[PDB]
Design a protein around this ligand. Structure first.
Ligand SMILES: [Cl-]
Ligand SMILES: [Cl-]
Ligand SMILES: [Cl-]
Ligand SMILES: [Cl-]
Ligand SMILES: [Cl-]
Ligand SMILES: [Cl-]
Ligand SMILES: [Cl-]
Ligand SMILES: [Cl-]
Ligand SMILES: [Cl-]
Ligand SMILES: [Cl-]
Ligand SMILES: [Cl-]
Ligand SMILES: [Mg+2]
Lengths: 211, 212, 211
C-alpha cells in the first residue's frame, strides 16, 4: 500500500508542523478531503486558522483532496461580516438593552460557503475571503488576499487578488477536470503517479481505458 | 440609559478580546471616542498596535465614536521615518560619536496626524500609514494598507489602497453626514437606534427635521 | 569612531535591534557590516529566512548599511513545488513516494536574492525568491517584493508597484559611482555630514582629492 495513512495526523515522523488536515477536524461545517495537509508555523491546528466560523450562520468550509495549504493561511468566514444597511456597528454584541437589535441572518451580507477544489496549492500567509470558490489545480501566491473566485488550474496572487496566468491551455484543463485523478482509488493513483506528477495528460487517458 | 458602559474595558460577557479603547488609553496623543472598540487577537492592548508614537513629536492619533477596529490593526505614526536626503541609514541611533548626526525634525518628512472619523469599520490586520484621514462611516477591508485618505461612507481595500465603491448614493451620504447621530445624546441615539441600524435614513431625516 | 560592526547588540538597552552579520551561523547567508535587523521581540535574522535548503544551494546576499524593519521575511527557493502536473509534494510523505522526488531541472528555481547597500526595507516586508534590489532603494512597509528593484527607487505593495525614483538619473549615477559603503570607515566618518544631508557634489570634490 504505497503512500502514507491519510488518517495519520503527523505523516512525516520527523516533522511536527505538517499535518494531514482531515483527521484533525473537530468542528462541523468543515469538510476537508484526504491527503490535504496544513504546514503550520508553530504546530497550530488547521481549525485555529478558520476564523469567524459560527454554527448559527451555517456557512461551510470545503477543501478537496491533495491540497497544499501554506503556513499562516487564514480562512475568513461570514462571522466577520457587519451589517451595512445603516451603521456597521454591532450594538447587539454589548446588550444592556441593545440585544433587541439582534440582526437576522438575512440582514447580514452572507457571501456563502468557501469552496476549495482538489490538488490546490495555497501559498504562505494567504487570506481567504468569505464565499470564495477555488478551482482544482489552482495556484495561489504567498501573501495573497483572495477577494474573489479562482478559476481551475490558474495562478493568482496579490491584494486585492489579481489573475497572473492559466497553467495550461483551455483544452488541457478540460482533460484534467474530466479525469479527476483525485477521486480514483489509491491503487489507480499509485499506478498513475508518474504521469500525474509530470503532467503527461495524454498518457493518463491511455492508462484509463474509456468507452 | 440603555447600553453598555463606555468606561467598561471588557463590556462583553465571556469575551477577553473585544475591548473599549478609550478607557485603556495610557499614552498621550491618542484621542479615541466613546464606544469605539478594538477586538484584539491574544487580548493585546490597543496602544501596543500604535507604533513609532513619541510624545515630544506631538504626533496625534484621533479616532471618533462607534468605530469597529479589527484584530491585528496597526497604526504607523511618523516617529521612525528615516531621512531621505541622502543615506536613509539612522547613524545617530548607534551613537558612539554618531549621536551628533541626529536629524532635525525640520529635516524629517512628517505627514501629520492620523485622523479616523466616526462609525468606521476597520477590518482585520489593517495597516494605517501616517497622516491619513479616514471619513465617517467608511469601511476598510481586511488586510488593507491605508496609504491615502479615505472618503466618508466609501469602501476601500488592498495594498496599496484602492477605491472599491461608495456605500450609498451621493444624496444618501449627505443625509448621514448632515445627521451625525454619533454627536447626538445617548438618549436620542437610543431613540433612533432601530433606524440607525436598518438604515432607514428617510425616517432619521424626518426625526431630525422634527428636532428643530 | 562609531559602533562596532561585530557587536550583536550595538545599542545599550536595545535587545531587539541587532547587527545581522555577527549573528549569522547558517550557510549561504551573506550580510555586510552595519546592516541591522530591528526585530519584534529579539528574534534572530536567520529565523526570518524561510525555505532555505542546503540541497538547492541558493544564497541570500545583503550589502552594508541596510535598514531591515521588523517582521521582514525572506522566501527562498525551497518553497516552490513542481508545476508540470500535480503540485502535491508526494515525495515528502515517502512510504513508497520518495522515488517521486523532483530534480532541480523539474523545479522553477528563481536564483539568489541579492540586496545592495544602504537599502531601507520597511516593516513586515516579504521578499520573493530570485529578487534583486538595487542600492539606496527604499522598500515601503507591508510590501511584497515580487520583482527586481532598481537602485534608488521607492517601491511597495502586493504585488510590487513602482512609486518613484528618489533622485534624478544623473544624481543616481553619481551615488552609484561613489559607493561610500565601500570607502574606509575613516573616510566615511569624515563624509557623514554629506552622506546624510545628500550633498553629493561636495562628495565628488572630496573623492576627487581622494582619487
Ligand atoms: Cl459556534
Ligand atoms: Cl454558496
Ligand atoms: Cl484581474
Ligand atoms: Cl518526467
Ligand atoms: Cl515619502
Ligand atoms: Cl484607486
Ligand atoms: Cl450624553
Ligand atoms: Cl536544510
Ligand atoms: Cl531516498
Ligand atoms: Cl575599514
Ligand atoms: Cl544639513
Ligand atoms: Mg495590490
Amino acid at each position: 500500500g504505497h503512500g502514507p495513512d491519510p488518517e495519520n495526523i503527523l505523516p512525516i515522523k520527523g516533522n511536527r508542523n505538517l499535518q494531514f488536515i482531515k483527521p484533525t477536524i473537530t468542528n462541523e461545517n468543515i469538510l476537508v478531503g484526504e491527503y490535504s495537509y496544513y504546514d503550520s508555523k508553530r504546530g497550530e491546528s488547521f481549525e485555529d486558522q478558520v476564523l469567524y466560523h459560527y454554527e448559527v450562520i451555517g456557512d461551510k468550509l470545503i477543501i478537496g483532496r491533495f491540497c497544499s495549504i501554506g503556513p499562516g493561511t487564514t480562512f475568513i468566514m461570514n462571522g466577520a461580516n457587519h451589517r451595512m444597511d445603516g451603521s456597521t456597528y454591532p450594538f447587539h454584541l454589548f446588550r444592556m438593552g441593545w440585544e433587541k437589535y439582534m440582526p437576522s441572518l438575512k440582514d447580514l451580507p452572507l457571501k456563502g460557503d468557501i469552496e476549495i477544489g482538489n490538488d490546490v496549492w495555497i501559498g504562505r500567509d494567504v487570506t481567504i475571503m468569505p464565499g470564495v470558490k477555488i478551482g482544482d489545480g489552482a495556484i495561489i501566491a504567498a501573501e495573497a488576499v483572495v477577494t474573489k473566485n479562482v478559476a481551475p488550474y490558474s495562478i493568482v496572487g496579490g491584494n486585492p487578488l489579481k489573475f497572473i496566468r492559466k497553467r495550461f491551455s483551455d483544452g488541457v484543463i478540460e482533460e484534467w477536470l474530466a479525469l479527476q485523478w483525485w477521486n480514483l482509488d489509491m491503487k489507480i493513483i499509485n499506478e498513475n503517479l508518474p504521469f500525474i506528477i509530470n503532467g503527461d495528460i495524454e498518457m493518463l487517458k491511455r492508462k484509463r481505458k474509456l468507452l
